[PDB]
Amino acid sequence: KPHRYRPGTVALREIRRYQKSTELLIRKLPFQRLVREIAQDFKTDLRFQSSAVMALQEASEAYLVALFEDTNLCAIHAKRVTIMPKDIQLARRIRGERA
Amino acid sequence: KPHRYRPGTVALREIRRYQKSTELLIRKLPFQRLVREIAQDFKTDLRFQSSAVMALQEASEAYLVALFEDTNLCAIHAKRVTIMPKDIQLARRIRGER
Amino acid sequence: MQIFVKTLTGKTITLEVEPSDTIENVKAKIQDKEGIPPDQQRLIFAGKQLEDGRTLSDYNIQKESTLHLVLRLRGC
Amino acid sequence: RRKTRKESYAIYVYKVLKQVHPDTGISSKAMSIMNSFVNDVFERIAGEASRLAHYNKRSTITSREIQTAVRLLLPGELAKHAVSEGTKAVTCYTSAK
Amino acid sequence: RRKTRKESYAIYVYKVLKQVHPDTGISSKAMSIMNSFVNDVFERIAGEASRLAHYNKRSTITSREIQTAVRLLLPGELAKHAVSEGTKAVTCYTSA
Amino acid sequence: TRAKAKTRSSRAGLQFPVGRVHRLLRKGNYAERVGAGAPVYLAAVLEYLTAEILELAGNAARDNKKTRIIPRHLQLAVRNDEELNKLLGRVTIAQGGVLPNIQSVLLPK
Amino acid sequence: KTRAKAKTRSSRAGLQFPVGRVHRLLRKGNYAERVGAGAPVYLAAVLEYLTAEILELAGNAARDNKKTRIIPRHLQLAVRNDEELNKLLGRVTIAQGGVLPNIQSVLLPKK
Amino acid sequence: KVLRDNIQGITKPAIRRLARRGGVKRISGLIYEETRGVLKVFLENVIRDAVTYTEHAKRKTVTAMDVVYALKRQGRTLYGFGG
Amino acid sequence: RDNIQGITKPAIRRLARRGGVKRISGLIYEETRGVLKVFLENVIRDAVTYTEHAKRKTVTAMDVVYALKRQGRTLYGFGG
DNA sequence: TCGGATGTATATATCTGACACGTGCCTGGAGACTAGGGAGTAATCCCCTTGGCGGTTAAAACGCGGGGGACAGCGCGTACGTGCGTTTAAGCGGTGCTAGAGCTGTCTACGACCAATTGAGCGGCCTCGGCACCGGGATTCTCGA
DNA sequence: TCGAGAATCCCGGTGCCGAGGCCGCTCAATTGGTCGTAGACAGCTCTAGCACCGCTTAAACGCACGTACGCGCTGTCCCCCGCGTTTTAACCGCCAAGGGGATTACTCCCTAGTCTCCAGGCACGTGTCAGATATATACATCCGA
């Protein structure tokens, strides 16, 4: 019979692997396209240095990681295992970001 | 035979009454004594101005009220009405304090 | 037992010492061979400082080891 | 070819590293990180000292302001060790001439 | 045996209040709060302008630095209205 | 001879002191030199902000059939507006109080 | 009229960071009207001490991994594992740093 | 005069009133100790900073300005007491 | 120009896995995209304001550092 | 589904302490003039950004079977809300007293500024060793049985 | 409880590119002397912070009782997870073209500094009315039958 793992082991393996390493997790070109589209709304015919895009990517990734950690804590507090949008909303409300 | 209110009405009455007012809640003399005792550990034979004590009381009360609001939100999030110490711990941890 | 000790200038000196010997005799011997007074020398072995009162045997040093010497003027 | 000169704390950081760890290198990214750290700490301490001097209507920045700002900024053990090091350095410098 | 002089912003705030609401008073603590608010906003704007002037290797602060600092600090509608008001004041002053 | 003096605030048509702001900028250790247009801009901005806050507070006070302004009215005016609350999101006002809200769950059935 | 040999101000204090550069930066930084003659020495000593502490911790962390060079991962590990240094850089993110390897206890497999 | 056992001066009804203003309806029996500890920590930090500010000026009396400056340094500035 | 869709689902899954999440619901992705859009909007607006004041046409990497620092989110290692 | 009892909102007299306003005056702001450097403007160099084309391969997209987790319902017993009688100390009004905050003279040591100059630090080259990468075997886990 | 597959780690050999060191030089930190004033020390004045005593009454305490909610247990149903197959666009390498950043030289005008003069803002004193208390009354609301 084909060999299958129980649901849950591969998630832990991925957790270990992805928090042991220090590489970026989002492809560069889609992020650059998104940054250009967002910045277009403020001033027309702009130009970007590559290091600026790299810094933006690093800051965004760090912010998202921290937010996800706090969301996981909030989800665990309510006797659950899966994160839900209400957890993100509660974390952002308590942190003072959302009004 | 004596008239009694069901558990919960007086709580809401007090909530409305104390949200409609602005005066301080903690007594003055015990707070002043606590401030003096705490400040003793840093330098002996210190003297205080009244306005400093008033400012300290105001800031402490505001901080406590905000913390209680966040704790109530945390308690509500988990399908509960009663607040517990773990809610305070979670609120302080999320806020970014050790 | 033979140990080589290096300086910040790449200057390497061979030194014969016994495992039971403690480092005060080692600094006295480098006074004998160099004359640097025994206060401005600091000896680092694989990133750890050495306590003066403790001996070489407790550190578990091996033959042909590589000890590093740094000089702190401290003069002022 | 004309190139403008840039100032950085590279050589001093390397000297400190070679003083502490006799055999250990460093890469460029770590150098930039350490430079940014030094600049940030310097700016924070200088700003706090300037504000403290302005509070007491005085027009001079002395070592007293630096010591008070250091005590106000850093945590306990770090503040104690930094104060000891600073006072030792100042005494050493004053004694010599 | 008189004390020294203490500066404040009470006169101008009272003038503005009488300009807006012609039949309204104000107590002492409200005046103190307004004074603190004015000083705090002034300090924020001045510090931001000084930093901005420092960044561009410049040795003076002009109306451009103040305008950019106001744009950076305040939210949208307040920033737009304040920019319009400051521009109007500057052109009216330079006209005379 | 010499002509009669006119304040710079009168020239700019403001109610805030231009000269005091200029002196504070010069003596505040912000830059080596200070331009000739910054005080006018700063005074205009400060006057606009003060006028907005005072108008909102006066409306709030007139709601409560009172003739004078107390810190409660200032707190109510500030906390009921979006941009003003955002500007003062980390400031506590003495003798202010709080906003009368109650979560919908705790209400009786 | 024979000028004596020049000796740097940092040499007299027995330091490594430049005293004169700090003095010039304080003078030209728009901090106060005048600057005393003792502040740069204090500031240089404090900066040198902090740099030495950070470098020692980072070098140890690098050595545990059998490497002879310091990369941003080692600096991040050294900073985040010390409570006081973590308190100091509370709101600072380091490029190419990563995160500390922790896992919540409840998520672990049962039995 | 040396003072001792003053943290218990913050009585249970005071905490109850603070919670009522905060919008709470039901309170467990273990909140009071946590509240006392949090208040003690906050007061310790603020008073330490204020005492340092006072000590710098070669004075012996803590003024309201020192408390205001200490509060501002921690990003919780206060209005209504000068400065 | 729906380039917001370029942040694909496995990327969010990888970010959450690094954050320490074990199970993910099916509606997190929209919230994540909205939060990212808001954050990028704010930071880019501040950087563009700095560049406009500088009287230039290409944003550098240094005013991005200024914009990040203004929000109390200091970044190290980019020539700060 | 009604009806009694309690708490809260509403109308009126009254008396007090803080708000609004008038005066003197003195210190800070305004008018007039110089002199010098910071900044605006034009011209040149070339580096770094943008755009396009081919391939190749890893990552993204789609479908399917199923086991484990979220959620609703039910029973119970204990902690917490409410009311009452008792005890405790906070609050208010005076009276004493002096330590220390605040202001004024003075006089000296300390820092800014300038001219000569020389050794520290930065830019360009290069050279080789530490680290990255590929192939292989030993080890350590997980999931039926 | 025990054993067959997968995933990971330790080892050895090979190549490359960037980090550590060497020269040359130019601009900034020293050195020496002078001059002006910022602040440190001494003296005096007066206010407010600490201490004490008495009295009143409002608030904190302890206790009894009932009931509502926090928590554990059980069952269902469905929706993420792991795995296989197909598709696509990211990435790397290369090649052109040009706009805008980065210096450099020159010149006009904008601001700092000084002197003289005078009026606006601050401290002090005073009258009076806006509102806080007290009293009484009318209405909204909650829990039981």
Numbering used by the authors:
A (entry chain E): 37 to 135
B (entry chain A): 37 to 134
C (entry chain K): 1 to 76
D (entry chain D): 26 to 122
E (entry chain H): 26 to 121
F (entry chain G): 10 to 118
G (entry chain C): 9 to 119
H (entry chain B): 20 to 102
Study text:
The nucleosome is the fundamental organizational unit of chromatin and comprises two copies each of histones H2A, H2B, H3, and H4 wrapped by ∼147 base pairs (bp) of DNA. The nucleosome contains a conserved cluster of negatively charged residues in histones H2A and H2B, known as the nucleosome acidic patch, that is a hotspot for interactions with proteins that regulate transcription, the cell cycle, and the DNA damage response. Monoubiquitination of histones H2B-K120 (H2BK120ub) and H2A-K119 (H2AK119ub) play opposing roles in transcription regulation and chromatin compaction. Our results suggest a mechanism by which H2BK120ub serves as a gatekeeper to the acidic patch and point to distinct roles for histone H2AK119 and H2BK120 ubiquitination in regulating protein binding to nucleosomes.
